[PDB]
């Protein structure tokens, strides 16, 4: 990964999380579960959706009859016509193949970036109130219940309350 999160210091994905692309797993005395971050997920969905639609919709077409008929004294322009069709074929095949290869790379990088940004967003607000394990988790130095966990996910987390 270009940004080093996915298959990075975060080694694997969560089948347990069904509601989004990126999210959180929390465990406290009240219970456990997976929760997807909707802000970062929906933005990613909006971005990728726009990318896909761009690749599809930017293609412009007119009504065209490709085929042409030539008699046996027209061989030269028949082959000119074939040269055109084959040239377009070489161009579109090459460009389509490379466009997909290159943009798939960028799409995976995009996800890798979003995970890292989310990770650093949480890490930034928690500060020294928690210790970073290195697998993408944080061991709290205080008690965090479901109301407290939601504050972290919501970005509304209150540092001075839990300053410990």
């Amino acid at each position: 990964g270009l940004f080093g999160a996915i298959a990075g210091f975060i080694e694997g994905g969560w089948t347990g999380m069904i509601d989004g692309w990126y999210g959180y797993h929390h465990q406290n005395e009240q219970g456990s579960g997976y929760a997807a971050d909707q802000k970062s997920t929906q933005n990613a969905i909006d971005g990728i959706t726009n990318k896909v639609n761009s690749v599809i919709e930017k293609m412009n077409t007119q009504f065209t009859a490709v085929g042409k008929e030539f008699n046996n004294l027209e061989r030269r322009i028949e082959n000119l016509n074939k040269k055109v069709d084959d040239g377009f074929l070489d161009i579109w095949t090459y460009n389509a193949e490379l466009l997909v290869l290159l943009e798939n790379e960028r799409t995976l990088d995009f996800h890798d970036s979003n995970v890292r940004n989310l990770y650093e967003k949480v890490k930034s607000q928690l500060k020294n109130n928690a210790k970073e394990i290195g697998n993408g988790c944080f061991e709290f130095y205080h008690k965090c219940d479901d109301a407290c966990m939601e504050s972290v996910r919501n970005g509304t987390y209150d540092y001075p309350k839990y300053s410990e």
Binding site: I6, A7, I10, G12, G13, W14, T15, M17, W21, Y22, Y24, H25, H26, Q27, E29, A36, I48, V52, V55, I56, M59, T61, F63, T64, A65, V66, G67, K68, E69, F70, N71, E74, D85, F88, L89, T93, A96, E97, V100, L101, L102, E103, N104, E105, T107, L108, H111, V115, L118, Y119, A130, G136, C137, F138, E139, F140, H142, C144, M149, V152
Partner: protein
Amino acid sequence: DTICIGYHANNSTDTVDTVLEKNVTVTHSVNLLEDSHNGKLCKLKGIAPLQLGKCNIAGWLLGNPECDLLLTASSWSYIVETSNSENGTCYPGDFIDYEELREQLSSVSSFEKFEIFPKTSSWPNHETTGVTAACSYAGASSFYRNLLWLTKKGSSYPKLSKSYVNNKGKEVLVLWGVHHPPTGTDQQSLYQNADAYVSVGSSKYNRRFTPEIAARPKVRDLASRMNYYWTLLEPGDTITFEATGNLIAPWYAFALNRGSGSGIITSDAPVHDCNTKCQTPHGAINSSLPFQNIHPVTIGECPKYVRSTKLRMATGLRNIP
């Protein structure tokens, strides 16, 4: 008490290719390549194609006795020929600018056949009864339905002049023919005049034909030849035929409004009442995606043809369950 940052995974086996790595398994993906068709010939622009059955376009326009006439719809978005369209010019010869004509008829509105020079009233001074075993119908020697073979009546072939004025308010396609006997004797026996000529003209069209007499192999057991010509007569314009012999005269002609940008498909696929924006010789395809590998020669608003067997775009992320 801990909170963890992580990402989605599922049971998806979908794979994509990336510039750095082949065959990466991703959670979600979309297909950019249309690799399938419906196996049908469909309507283009809401209109069915012209189907010629046993005949090719030449047989149909000339009225080859084996072709079913008058059955043509008043419009079509393209033309379909099949592996079974064998019936062309039954009288051997050249059809001049044939490909051009096929192109010009590829799409039409307001198409109608009509009698330009009625057989009974048009030629009092010439014989209209000429037939050949080469164009046979119902066990008898016959001829093209849309043309007339004019020969001399009683050893004489007087100078003929025949005009048609186009009052139909659209273009008129006029087809005719010029007969080329193998020998000078045949020329005299049919048309009387060794010096015979055919002249055809309108405001924008002028051409003269003379018989080219040459010894030559029998085709469909005929050593003679018959060449076919055509022109598009503009609304209001007049066409004039003048001949001292050899004219295979227009009997029926065609009034039409030409479309544009269409073409001819050769396919044995069945025609149906379905609608498509893109037709291929194999069948119709969806036009939503940018690329298709079905066939390079298409008619419609079509995805670009490519050699690709697979184009698949990653949407979701690397799947690591």
